[PDB]
Write a protein that binds this DNA or RNA. Sequence first.
DNA 1: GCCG
DNA 2: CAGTA
DNA 3: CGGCAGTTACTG
Length: 323
Amino acid sequence: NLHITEKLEVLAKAYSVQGDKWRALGYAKAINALKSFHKPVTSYQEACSIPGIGKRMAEKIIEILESGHLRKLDHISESVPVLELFSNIWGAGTKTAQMWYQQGFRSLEDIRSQASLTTQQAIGLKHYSDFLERMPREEATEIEQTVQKAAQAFNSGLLCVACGSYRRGKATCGDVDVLITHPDGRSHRGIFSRLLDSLRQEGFLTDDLVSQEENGQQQKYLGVCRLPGPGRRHRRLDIIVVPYSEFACALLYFTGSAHFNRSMRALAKTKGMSLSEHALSTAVVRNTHGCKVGPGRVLPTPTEKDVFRLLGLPYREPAERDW
DNA sequence: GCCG
DNA sequence: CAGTA
DNA sequence: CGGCAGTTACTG
Ligand SMILES: Cc1cn([C@H]2C[C@H](O)[C@@H](COP(=O)(O)OP(=O)(O)OP(=O)(O)O)O2)c(=O)[nH]c1=O
Ligand SMILES: [Mg+2]
Ligand code: NA
Ligand code: NA
Ligand code: NA
C-alpha cells in the first residue's frame, strides 16, 4: 500500500547514490513505515503520527496528495541516473561513481574504455546485467547443493546451510548465501582452500570478488558461479565459514534481513548489550559516542532462539525477519 | 531524513 | 587508511 | 547535539 512512496523512493536513491547516507536512511525508514501501514494516508496529522515520519517528510506527503507531484523531484541533479548506473557496478560505490562522473564519464562504454578499474569492478562490469538479476530460489538450491556436495566430499561432517533471502523463503534470490560450519567445533578451520579449489576443478566458480586465501583465517568468499547446461546465467555466490560456537549468531546474521539485523543490533545496544555475527554480549562498556570501549561478556547462545530470548524478544521464523 |  | 562489501 | 549495526570482513 501507498504509492506516495514510489515518489519518495526516487529521492531516497538520489540521496543514496550522492553519498548522503543518513538522509537516505531517513527516507528509507519513512518509505518503509508508509509501506507497512494498514490504510492509505490522507491527512497531514495522520502522517506525523506515524513513527518514522516527521514534519519534513509529512510536509512532502501532503503535496504528494494535494498536488499529486513533488516539486523537489523536478530539481534532482541530472547526474543521479549516471551515478546510479556507475554505482551498480560491483565494487564501485558512491565515491567512485562521483569521481568517474566528475571526470566526464557518462556511460558504461565510457567506463569500459577509459576508466581505471579494480579487479572487482572489472568483474562487476563483465557481469553487469547478471548482477542486477535475481534467480528463482530453485536455482539457489542447486547452487547450495553444489557447494555442500564439494564440502562434504572431503569432510561429511561439515554442516552447510543456505541463508539470506533463501532461508527467509523469498521466491527469488539476489545471490546464494551459504553458511558452513562443523559440529565438532574445529574441523571448519582452513577448509576454504580445499572447497574453492574443488569448486574450481569442476569449473563451477568463474570469478572471485573477495577471497583472502592466503589467510588461514578467511571468513568469507564472495564470487561468481554458473551451473552447467544452456540457459544458465552467472550467479553471485556468498560463502562464510564460522566456528560452531558462533553458529547461532552467524546463522541469525546471515539470514537477515539486513534491516532486521540492524534493528536487532540497535535494540541490543539500548540494553547495554552488543550483537554481531560473532556473538551476543552483555555488560558492554561504551563511550559517550556509543562506540564499544569494553568487550563485556559473551552470552551463551547455542540457538537463534536463545538470542531472541536474551533480548527479551519473541522468536521469529526466518520468513518473519524479511524486513 | 527521524528521533532521543 | 578509505572504500565497498 | 549527534547517533543512525557490527570495535562486522576484504582490498590496495
Ligand atoms: C548487505 C548486508 C547483509 N547483511 C546480512 C543479512 C543478509 O540477509 C545477509 C546476506 O546479504 P545479502 O545476500 O545481500 O542479502 P539477502 O540475501 O537478504 O538478499 P538478496 O537476495 O539480495 O541477496 O547478510 C547484513 O547484516 N548487512 C548488510 O549490509
Ligand atoms: Mg543473498
Ligand atoms: Na556497486
Ligand atoms: Na584472493
Ligand atoms: Na550475499
